[PDB]
């Protein structure tokens, strides 16, 4: 069955929380756990970070937390570090189903010299390494939450939601899908179609795959799930298999869903977008449609949701 979540008063707010904590006075949260999400063949580490905010920093699905890593701002002596934003990967109830924790999905940013591969700790991403190096009990300076672009439209509980992720961009969708399928939320009973597309480098780089695969068996008429593994698969045009190529395998179904009012979401590194736009333009052309006109209508209709970084 669906998992009991508490406290249900988290459903009462009519607007998303925004900027509850600000950079000059962050909330000092506590790490619950840090675990690698990836196997040995993954090109880099991505970790799942669980943070106890005590119920003091609630959020809605699709929002981001800010994290201020320790140390001086290298560009502003005497000043704290700049906030880094992370898409929240949990529902508002969090992974403990209690409204006290939130989770992040963090790629460790590691520098390698382009010719020798030599590392340099001074050039590593400050906050991603800080988070992935964290341990239970460590303290985190948390700000926010913030963001509205990726809030889940719940007005139609039978809407269609097409979720396009690369890498850590799966984060908001983990939250959406737990709310849609896993958690007992009496005021949001999802009966539409949720369709997750995930592009990663290889099978060892998959994120939360067992969770998503479980939804196929639990909600076979409401959930679809397709994966692209760039270093292990090739598209029909012999390039590395990217998320836009998987979309094209379902070009007719996807365009029909869009025409029927589906929401479509994009999240992950901003470099995922040019190839997606190229594929959608070519799909439209083969159908005798103008992708420019289709995208203009999707934006006008508030069906098009992008948060890339
Ligand atoms: C709305 C939104 C949502 C998200 C994200 C952004 C935004 C705007 N991000 C990105 C996140 O905010 C952040 O930018 C990255 O984690 C990198 O931050 P660091 O502090 O690790 O790198 P930092 O900001 O310190 O450095 C940036 C980059 O520069 C490189 N670098 C530094 N000095 C260098 C030098 N001298 N030469 C060469 N390279 C050098 C670092 O290695 C790093 O790759 C994200 N990220 C994520 O992992 N998961 C998520 O869910 C999200 N979500």
TrEMBL record:
Q: Which GO terms describe its biological process?
A: photosynthesis
What is the disulfide pattern of this chain?
47-132
UniProt similarity note: Belongs to the ferredoxin--NADP reductase type 1 family.
Primary location recorded for the protein, binned into one broad class: plastid
| Cofactor(s) the record lists | FAD
Q: What is this protein called?
A: Ferredoxin--NADP reductase, chloroplastic
Record: residues binding NADP(+): 87, 107, 168, 200, 230-231, 240, 242, 244, 267-269, 271, 307
The chain positions of domain FAD-binding FR-type read 24-152
Which molecular function terms from Gene Ontology are attached?
Answer: ferredoxin-NADP+ reductase activity; nucleotide binding
| Catalytic reaction list | 2 reduced [2Fe-2S]-[ferredoxin] + NADP(+) + H(+) = 2 oxidized [2Fe-2S]-[ferredoxin] + NADPH
Encoding gene (name): LOC542713
Q: Which organism is it from?
A: Zea mays
Subcellular compartments: Plastid, Chloroplast
